[PDB]
């Protein structure tokens, strides 16, 4: 009786998806917030 091993796709996704989401949030906020004119 064998058992399925832990999916490497899920293992690397655990570190990928939050990392991509954080990078996207950083780029989005940085490029959009400091956009208005100043005196």
């Amino acid at each position, epitope marked *: 009786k064998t058992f399925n091993s832990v999916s490497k796709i899920d293992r690397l996704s655990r570190i990928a998806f939050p990392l991509l989401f954080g990078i996207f949030n950083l780029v989005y906020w940085a490029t959009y917030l400091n956009r208005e004119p100043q*005196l």
Partner: nanobody
Amino acid sequence: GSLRVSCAASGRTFTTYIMAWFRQAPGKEREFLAAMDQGRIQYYGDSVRGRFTISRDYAKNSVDLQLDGLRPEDTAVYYCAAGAGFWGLRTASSYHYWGQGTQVTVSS
């Protein structure tokens, strides 16, 4: 002498934006000449009030400036800009779009 300089936009409709003209002489900062608003409303700088005339053709999306009564120290490169006037309508910093500039020289 008299002259007419046209400025045609492309890639973006500026019918709702404010279209203005600026001047840059050698060794001076950018000076506001004239501006036209969405409501066909005209603003002019004091140094060039009563001489220059600004017009906007919304159909072909362009702003024209008619220069009359030129005097020799008006030689400069003229820039065309379009944008919404925030903190501005007279300051260059309020415009995001600018032309490459056209040189104008007056000979005595």
